[PDB]
Every structure is written in C-alpha cells, then in structure tokens.
Write a protein that binds this ligand. Structure first.
Ligand SMILES: CNC(=O)c1c(C)[nH]c(/C=C2\C(=O)Nc3ccc(Cl)cc32)c1C
Length: 253
C-alpha cells in the first residue's frame, strides 16, 4: 500500500524497466523485493495494459512460482518474494566460469519444481533461465509470465511456434527440455550464427548428449522433451512419474 512501510535495503539489479531492490517490511521484518517502475513517461494506452497485468499477478499462490505480495503507487512498486539464490542464468554463467558442471541432484530439483510450476500454470488456462529463481532453501521458482512481459537469438523456439502452429502445453515441455539441457551442458541444445540457420538445426532435431556425468535416465527424459513431434514429448504427469524424481527433489519451506 505505501512505500513508507518498507525499508529499502539495497539495489539487486537495474534495467530498461527500472530497478529491482531488496526491501524489509516494517510489519514483521519480512525480507522481500520490489520492482521500481516509472510510469510518468508512458501513455495511457500502455498504462491500460500495465494495470491489467499487476492484478493478473495476484492470482497464483504456488510454492514454485514467485509470489506477489503488494503494489504501491507513489513510480510504481511491485512487491515480490525475495529469491536469495538469484536466477538460473547466473548459475549457468558461474558453472561455465568455474569450469564446473552442476550436480545431477540440482538438475532433478529444477526439473521436478518447474514441472510442478507448469502443472499449475496449465491449470490456470517463455521458460528462460533468466526467468527462473532460487531461494536460500534449495527451492526453485518460476517467474510470473505476466511480470516478465511488463519488465539465432531465441534457442527455445519450439517447432510448433516455428512451423506457425498454434501454441499448446507441449510447447512448454520443449522449452523445459532446452532449459534442463542448458543446465546440464552449460550450452543450449541448438546453436547457430543465424536464426534461419537455427531453425534448420531445430528441425533436424539433433544435439549432443548431455555430459556423461549425467545418468542415462536423466538424458532420456531431457531428450524426450526435445522431440520434434509434440505428441512424443512427455506430459507434466509423465515427467513426475519418472523414477528419478523423489520427495527430496520437491519444494521444502
Ligand atoms: C545476481 N542476481 C541476484 O543476486 C538476484 C537476487 C538475490 N534476487 C533476484 C531476483 C528476484 C528476487 O529476489 N525476487 C524476484 C521476484 C521477481 C523477479 Cl522477476 C525477480 C526476483 C536476483 C536476479
């Protein structure tokens, strides 16, 4: 409701949208974040979209989706859950930098927890590592797609989107496979110097196996999600039935 109820601790990041800050709530010392957005420069036509988007973010309370808390108008402040471990893109960047592949156990947590985020998203009815967040307790959280909207280049561009087919939930499984693959290989499954060259790679359907430190079973599941035919990809339910996925891979709060 009011910005005087929150103590600004520090700036986490910045962008063309505005600023991301870590904040402590005066109520009960709750550590959260806000996105600081200047609307003063925008037209009403863009303001009609933005207001419709802030309220749409109020809908999903889920352990594996970043949680909305509050909105303030002063500048617009969108008050979100704090994710101590930051985003997945930085984890990948750090892996590359330190020459260190991620533990299979971490990859299984991401797979389990994002698949559950997707199960929920699909019930309501762009999975990039930059839009996936980690708390301090091994939990994985999907960023609100509506939040990311208001805030070969694509790589995760499913054959359906490409072949001008309408979107389906199996397209999200494809994007999940690309993310989990990149998490294992520290590179996306398909890469090229042009977008039409990227399209050629994706449609051919071929990629390197994930590093040999990952089990045959993990490799099998990622590979399955990267099938060209949407009907050969596993459903959310089929993914979670996988023997690899255990209680300890789920959220714990
Ligand atoms: C290097 N990045 C960080 O350390 C980092 C940290 C500690 N938190 C974040 C990001 C978020 C964070 O902590 N809460 C969030 C809620 C929504 C969105 Cl879109 C992002 C965040 C980031 C990117």
């Amino acid at each position: 409701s009011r910005a005087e109820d929150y103590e600004v601790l520090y700036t986490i990041g910045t962008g063309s949208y505005g600023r991301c800050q870590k904040i402590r709530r005066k109520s009960d010392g709750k550590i959260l974040v806000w996105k600081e957005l200047d609307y003063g420069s925008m037209t009403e036509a863009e303001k009609q979209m933005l207001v419709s988007e802030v309220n749409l973010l109020r809908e999903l309370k889920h352990p594996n989706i970043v949680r909305y808390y509050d909105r303030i108008i002063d500048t617009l402040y969108i008050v979100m859950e704090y994710c101590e471990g930051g985003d997945l893109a930085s984890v990948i960047t750090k892996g590359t930098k330190e020459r260190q592949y991620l533990d299979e156990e971490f990859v299984l947590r991401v797979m389990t927890q994002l698949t559950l985020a997707l199960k929920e998203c699909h019930r309501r009815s762009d999975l990039k590592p930059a839009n996936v967040f980690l708390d301090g307790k091994q939990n994985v959280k999907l960023g609100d797609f509506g939040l990311a909207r208001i805030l070969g280049t694509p790589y995760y561009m499913s054959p359906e989107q490409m072949n001008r087919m309408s979107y389906n939930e199996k397209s999200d499984i494809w994007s999940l496979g690309c993310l989990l693959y990149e998490l294992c290989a520290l590179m996306p499954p398909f890469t090229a110097f042009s977008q039409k060259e990227l399209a050629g790679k994706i449609r051919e359907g071929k990629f390197r196996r994930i590093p040999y430190r990952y089990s045959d079973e993990l490799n099998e599941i990622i590979t399955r999600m990267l099938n060209l035919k949407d009907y050969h990809r596993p459903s959310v339910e089929e993914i979670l039935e996988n023997p690899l996925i255990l209680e300890h891979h789920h959220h714990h709060h």
